[PDB]
């Protein structure tokens, strides 16, 4: 198995998810117009958040420790049992909070209390989201790129079917329910694929508790908590700088670039958690880690550069196809943003190493480094060049950050502190 082969599997599953999303999104737009989209905005962002929140963000830890103990049946059972207990316990608590506060949640999502029933349904749907993501994380711990990809592919296709039936039957609220069911229905193929492929015995998923492993998986919950604040906060007051001296139109230009660039990043690095994270988890010697990091960088940097150069050449086609034609000056932002994306992908290789070593301390330092760099560059370039400056600030940020990652890796590999 290799990073290249994992990318081949993961690209096929990600492309189907993108094609399915574009199909469902245009069906929702044609059916309910801008009024339906504006009312679905918060609800859709909640569905995204639940993809990590429903299982308490332990998923990367599940992959890390399953990989570490994939040849240790006794510990592997303990890992999966504790992970099952943590996902079951938190998802159950989440379901109770959702059903009990369905009225305040509906008010915050839609502006009134008329959606309490949909919120109460989501309280049960998020259980499928959490459990499905756990099963996928288990497969990634075994580096089963094919099982992971086939599961996501089946889930996307059945998700489109479920969305069609749901909105045809129940109108707008049925459509929203279908949106929540898209990531939840993956649990059906994921459970089937995991058992049929012989990855682990079904009994491993019975909830158990191990205090040690629970504390270790909690470290990945804490990284998930940190990640959901730092850089999101950074982009929020980046938009603040933008609106302070420019129009909302320029703000929209930048937000469109960032959101589509983030989706581009998620597609390109989706195989990192499938291959890179479990592989680096098993390796402990510095020579072996360096070899794998070097080999990964030698593959991913030319691949992403070639892909990003192609995208920049077709930036006008990418804008016309992927986004609503309400803004077409972002083309000048593509070059800067795409360069930053290439170096950010390179920086992800070091970031997944930190995940693979469960280093909470290096995770904090990596996150704070990105936040501060983003702020120094944004505070400089945004007030002078608007959305173009925001793209320049993003690019400059990850030029410096990738270089910093290399230097810190060299100091760590050479044991500068010993």
């Amino acid at each position, epitope marked *: 198995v290799s990073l290249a082969k994992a990318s081949l599997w993961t690209a096929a599953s990600t492309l189907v998810k993108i094609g399915a999303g574009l199909l469902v999104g245009k069906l929702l737009a044609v059916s309910f117009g801008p009024a339906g989209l504006g009312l679905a905005a918060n609800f859709r962002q909640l569905i995204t958040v639940l993809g990590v929140l429903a299982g308490a963000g332990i998923f990367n830890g599940v992959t890390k420790y399953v990989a570490q103990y994939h040849d240790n049946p006794q510990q592997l059972r303990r890992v999966v049992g504790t992970s099952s207990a943590m996902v079951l316990g938190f998802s159950t608590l989440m379901a109770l909070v959702f059903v009990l506060a369905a009225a305040p949640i509906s008010q915050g999502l839609f502006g009134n209390t*008329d959606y*309490q029933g949909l919120v109460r349904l989501v309280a049960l749907v998020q259980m499928g989201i959490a459990w499905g993501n756990l099963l996928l994380a288990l497969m990634k711990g075994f580096r089963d790129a094919a099982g992971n990809a086939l599961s996501l592919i089946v889930g996307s296709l059945i998700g489109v079917l479920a969305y069609y039936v749901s909105y045809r039957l129940g*109108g*707008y609220e049925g459509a929203l329910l279908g949106l929540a069911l898209i990531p939840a229905l993956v649990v059906i193929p994921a459970a089937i694929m995991l058992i049929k492929r012989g990855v682990i015995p079904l009994s491993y998923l019975k909830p158990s508790w191990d205090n040690g492993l629970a504390g270790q998986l909690s470290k990945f919950t804490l990284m998930a908590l940190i990640t959901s604040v730092t850089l999101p906060v950074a982009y929020i007051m980046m938009r603040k700088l933008l609106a302070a001296q420019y129009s909302w139109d320029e703000v929209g230009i930048w937000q469109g670039v960032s959101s589509i660039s983030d989706a581009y990043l998620q597609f390109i690095t989706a195989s990192f958690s499938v291959y890179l994270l479990p592989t680096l988890s098993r390796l402990t010697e510095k020579r072996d880690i360096t070899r794998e990091v070097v080999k990964s960088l030698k593959f991913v940097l030319p691949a992403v550069a070639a892909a990003s150069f192609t995208v920049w050449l077709l930036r006008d086609f990418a804008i016309w196809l992927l986004l609503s034609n309400k803004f077409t000056a972002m083309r000048d932002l593509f070059a800067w943003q795409l360069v930053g994306d290439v170096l950010k992908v390179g920086a992800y290789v070091f970031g997944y190493l930190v995940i693979a070593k469960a280093s909470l301390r290096f995770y904090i330092l990596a996150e704070v480094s990105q936040f501060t760099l983003l702020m120094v560059f944004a505070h400089w370039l945004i007030p002078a060049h608007g959305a173009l400056g925001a793209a320049q600030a993003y690019m400059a940020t990850y030029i410096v950050y990738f270089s910093l990652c290399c230097g810190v890796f060299l100091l760590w590999r050479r044991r500068a502190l010993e």
Partner: nanobody
Amino acid sequence: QLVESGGGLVQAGGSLGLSCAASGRTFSNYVMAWFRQAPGKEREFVARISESRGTTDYADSVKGRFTISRDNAKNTIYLQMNSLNPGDTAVYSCAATLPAWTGIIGGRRPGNYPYWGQGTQVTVS
């Protein structure tokens, strides 16, 4: 887009007539409905008239007692309420939405109507 008229304090057993006016242009394509919300509960379905064949739907609590009608000439809809019992005391609101928002069996869900009126009070002594 929607304004309500009628209602108030009525003696139990007496009749009452609510009316709702709509602005805009395209009105015959909007499904029209009445909802009510009593103090302490949530918005519940009352009655609904379609945009096409003039079909009607009623909650089991008002069937036979309440009758909804529409007039596409003046873009208004009405609700006649006979045999008013104390359980009918609520704020009554008219709602408008397109048939794609209701689907096949979602015509009773208030979240399928994005356009609402201010609401008129009905108190059955």
